[PDB]
Structures are given as structure tokens and as C-alpha cells.
Chain length 330, copies 2
């Protein structure tokens, strides 16, 4: 029905972002899923088109309303920041600043409702810093500019959406970090994102910390009752459809069967293993809790191959697809 | 190829074991996979056959060599322990002892090389104790009679075999329990069982404790280096094909692709979630470290339905199939 507008940020101009965007938008499949709007540098996209041997024309626009989404011609909100001769594959404070400016513009468009999702091409933290934007990372920058303190990481597969209470932390520290506030906010973020994506009443299942969710006290130190159950109870009383804590393995079986719209995993491997085992296109991370859904790829600026036309666009295509499926419905 | 002999133990005569055994062996598919030998009570199997409306005849035999494996006629190593009138659905000291005696006989047969796998029908712990056999459970009794201090639990799916260093224990205590001796033995058990099943040099992948296996010390308290790596190195030096610790999720991806014959999971949910998400026939547990592979079903003696002919044999069929696949090759 509605084809969502996806704001695609070009990332660091010295890295593979421009090339991967231009290769991605040569696929007709993209235009079955979304209306792809590039925020970036029009000249850099033209250079990338030459580098990849593409047939893409670039249309310089100022406002999202000017975009036509005609295959063969990329609509680029052109900030004009990148010198024509900026080298590929080397650190650039100018490219770092421009990567920030593309992200800032994306956040602005998301706030005004002019895009329905963000898909971020890679940037380089060192260049970002040199360019005057000393953020801890790409995701942290999006969150700060959006005005939110926390986001959650989600993985998506067929029948499976898995949002994480904790991710990149040691397992012992993970268990310490989980408590009802963070669990509650993780569930809320997942619920809100699925409502935006057109599921009016998301069916949410929540994993235990212990196997079998503790088996009525048989396993563990009461982590379910201390850390999880108070959040679940509060959100049930608010009217959300939340079940758990459940044995994580049983919940994944049921989710795969179609019983749940969302699985809330407590820690990294609990949620990541069941998605990764399926062997699907790797490298896409979903960020939950900004004004619109955001996706990205995990491959980096790849300076060793930047400007050589060899970067593979498969991960980006999947990031766009996942972004389109979770985009805000209008 | 060789059809392995599976020693099927009848379990507790008051429970659903006899019924599920008689229902299972009515399936022609079993006979394409194995030669099914029942250790139990011939009169009880006859009574079960009447109950389930079957057409099975029972042949009383003394020695495994007598078994004919003719469809329609179950070869039963008949210990003659169960009175004809023993009620279904009630605890019995005689039934509890007989369940122990069937297991004991299966262990003897495995030791002499007269069966290639064991598949156990359910028994009842309270009845076992009532018959003078004070074991913590079914699996513990098998281990004790076999002469081993430890076994490991394994789950099997297409392209995935996942053996666990720890299972039913809280997550904090699991990480404490893991140390290099236990890791080493888990890997050894897994390797030996796959060699028995005809994989000369098993390719083994080992999971980390921390996500990303610690990411070079970024996550966690050095658990990989303390608890896992000394075991992996020792076994590599001894000539086993062992890779890890690896990020668990990456390892599951690779295993699903065919890169490993065995995945060594550190704790319950790490290994169980990726198997269960696949949504395949549930209920089957594989015990590794006895003289031959052993499988079993989760469902218990089910005294509430014992003797009524309603017990479903799906789980037991899958337990037989998995047992046949992992049976000792001759
Ligand atoms: Ca975290
Ligand atoms: Ca254990
Ligand atoms: Mg190509
Ligand atoms: Mg039937
Ligand atoms: Zn990760
Ligand atoms: Zn379990």
C-alpha cells in the first residue's frame, strides 16, 4: 500500500557509503518497498556512480517534497559539503562533519514527519571527532540529536522480532544491569515501534534471565521476581499485551510459530543466537526508540576498498528492506 | 546400510511407557531406521496393545540374538516382573524396581555391544525410590550403572548438534560451575559420541561465555581465558578439531551452514534457543557419555492418562529416529 519514505544518510564521504547507496538504488526491488531519499552530497554520488559503472543520474533537491522517486535518478538533499577532489580511503575532518550534518538533517526530517525511517550508511568515529562532533558513536549521535537518553537494539527475521534489554556487556554485568526500569523501557520502546509500523496491539513475550524463567525458584537467585516481573505487571495494568517472563527457548519456539509480534531478550546471546542460526543476510542492526525506526549495516567505512567500486550492497539492501517493513505507517 | 539395534526400555509399568512403545512400533518408518528391541514386560506390552487397539503380538526372548525384528511382532527381553493386574496410574515399588532392572539390562547390553543405542520410555522417580533405588533421576541412574560420573545433554536439529557444558542451573551459578575440566570433558564426550556414529574427525565449535567471546577483554571478567581456553588448547594439542571460544551467535550461523559437526554451548538458553526457534518436533533429549547414545522424551509417566490409550507417540518416534542417527556404527 503506502510506500514509506526512507531518509538514507550518505555517511563519511571518504568511505564506501556513497558507492553502496548508488549500487543499492540500481535495484528495482528497493522501489517496491520504499521511496528512497538520499541526504548527502550530489557530486559525491555522481563520482560513486562513475566508480561503480552505474547509469544513475543525481537530482539536487533542497526539500524532501521535491523528490520524485523515479528509478534511474536519485533524489539527493545535497548539502554541497564535500570538495570534488576529496580522496577516498583517507581520514577527513570535512567528511566527518558532513556525516554529522546528514544525520542532523535526517533527525530534523523525522521530527517534522517528512521521512518514515532512517537508513544510515557508515561513518568513521575518528573523522567525526576531527570534524568537531565528539560523540561516542553513530547510534549515540542519533540519540543525542533526537533528544532521547536510551535506545534499544533489535534483530529481525521471518516471524521473529527480538529486542534486547542488554547487548554489548559481559554476561555477569548484564544480569546486574537488568532491573525493572530498563526492562519496562525496553518493552515500551518495542511496543511503540510496532504500533508505528501498524500493529495496533503488539503481542509481546518476555524472556527470563534463568533457564525455564527460574522454574518457580528452582534455578537462580530470584532474578525474575526482582528484575522482570514488576515491569511486566505495570505494563499489563497499563493495557499492553505482555506475557512473561517465559522460558526463553519455549518463547522462541512460539514466536517462530506466529504467537508473538515481539520477543524481549534479556541479554545478547539469548536473542542473537536464535536469529543468527537461520542463516539469513548478515550485518543489519535495527535501532529502536528514535522518532522513526533506524537501520544500519555493520561493515564500516572500509577505507581499504573505498573508491574502488567493489563494496557489496547486499547488507545495505537488507537494511533498506527491514527499514521499510518497520517504517512509520501513514 | 547397517540398521542399528536400539534397546528400548519400557520404563514404569504404571505409566504410559508400554503404551507409547506399542504405538511407536506400529509405524513402518521405525523399521527403516533401526531394529527395535524392547527390554521390559511382555504381559504389560500385551495389555498395552489391547488398550491402544493395536494388532501387535509379543515374542518373549531371553537374549538379544533371538530378536527377529518382524513388523507386527515385538521382540521383548521379558524380565517377568510386573503382575498381570498391576494398576495403571499409581505408584508401585515393583514397577519402580522393574524400571531400574530394564535400564540395568540395557546398560549390560550396551557394554557387551549387543545394542547400538538406548531409547528410554518414562519412569517415575518416587516409584524408583519405592523400589529401593534412591537416584536423583532417570539420567543419573543410567550414569551410575554405566560407571561414569558425568554425562552431557545434547539437542539435535538438521545441521545442528548442540552439546551443553551446563543445563539446569541458574545462569549466575552456571558461569561459576564452568571451568576447564568440565569444558574439556564435555568436548571429549561430544567427540567420542560422534566418532561412534561414524564421524572420524568431528569438527567442533565452542561458544564463549561472554558475547563476542569477550571481544578481546572488552566484555566480562576473563571467563574465556579462565574457564574455556585451557581446555580447547589441550584438546587441540591432542589432535581434536576444536575451534573457539567463538561468539556464540556467529558459531550458530556457521554451524547451520555446515561448518561444524558439533556446537558446544556453555549454558542452557545459549544452546536451546537456536534449536527451539526452528519449531521442529519437540520433547527429545539426547544423553551423551554412556557406552552408547541414549535418547528420551520429556513427557513423564503421565499417570493421569496411563492405561487409557491416548498417549501420543510423536515424541517417542523422534527419540527413536535421533537415536538411530547417533547409534554406534558397526
Ligand atoms: Ca547493554
Ligand atoms: Ca548443569
Ligand atoms: Mg555489483
Ligand atoms: Mg494413534
Ligand atoms: Zn554483538
Ligand atoms: Zn530445560
Amino acid at each position: 500500500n503506502y510506500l514509506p519514505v526512507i531518509g538514507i544518510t550518505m555517511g563519511d564521504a571518504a568511505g564506501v557509503g556513497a558507492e553502496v547507496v548508488v549500487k543499492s538504488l540500481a535495484h528495482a526491488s528497493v522501489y517496491a518497498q520504499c521511496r528512497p531519499l538520499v541526504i548527502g552530497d550530489a557530486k559525491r554520488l555522481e563520482r560513486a556512480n562513475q566508480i561503480v559503472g552505474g547509469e544513475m543520474k543525481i537530482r539536487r533537491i533542497e526539500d524532501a517534497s521535491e523528490a520524485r522517486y523515479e528509478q534511474g535518478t536519485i533524489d539527493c538533499i545535497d548539502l554541497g559539503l564535500i570538495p570534488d577532489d576529496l580522496p577516498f580511503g583517507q581520514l577527513s575532518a570535512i567528511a566527518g562533519d558532513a556525516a554529522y550534518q546528514y544525520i542532523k538533517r535526517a533527525v530534523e526530517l523525522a521530527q517534522s514527519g517528512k521521512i518514515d525511517a532512517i537508513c544510515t550508511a557508515p561513518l568513521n568515529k575518528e573523522a567525526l571527532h576531527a570534524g568537531g562532533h565528539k560523540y561516542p558513536g553513530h547510534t549515540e549521535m542519533l540519540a543525542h540529536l533526537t533528544g532521547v537518553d536510551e535506545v534499544s537494539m533489535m534483530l529481525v527475521a521471518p516471524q521473529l522480532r527480538v529486542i534486547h534489554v542488554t547487548t554489548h556487556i559481559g554476561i555477569i554485568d548484564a544480569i546486574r544491569k537488568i532491573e525493572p526500569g530498563l526492562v519496562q523501557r525496553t518493552i515500551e520502546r518495542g511496543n511503540a515501534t510496532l504500533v508505528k509500523a501498524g500493529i495496533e496491539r503488539p503481542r509481546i513475550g518476555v524472556c527470563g534471565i534463568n533457564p525455564h524463567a527460574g522454574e518457580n525458584g528452582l534455578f537462580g537467585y530470584g532474578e525474575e521476581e526482582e528484575k522482570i516481573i514488576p515491569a511486566v505487571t505495570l505494563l499489563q495494568e497499563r493495557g499492553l499485551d505482555v506475557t512473561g517472563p517465559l522460558p526463553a527457548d519455549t518463547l522462541f519456539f512460539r514466536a517462530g510459530r506466529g504467537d508473538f509480534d515481539l520477543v524481549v531478550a534479556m541479554y545478547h546471546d539469548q536473542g542473537h543466537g536464535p536469529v543468527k542460526v537461520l542463516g539469513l543476510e548478515a550485518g543489519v542492526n535495527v535501532t529502536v526508540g528514535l522518532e522513526v525506526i533506524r537501520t544500519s549495516v555493520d561493515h564500516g567505512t572500509a577505507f581499504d576498498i573505498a573508491g574502488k567500486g567493489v563494496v557489496d550492497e547486499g547488507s545495505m539492501l537488507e537494511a533498506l528492506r527491514q527499514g521499510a517493513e518497520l517504517a512509520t505507517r501513514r
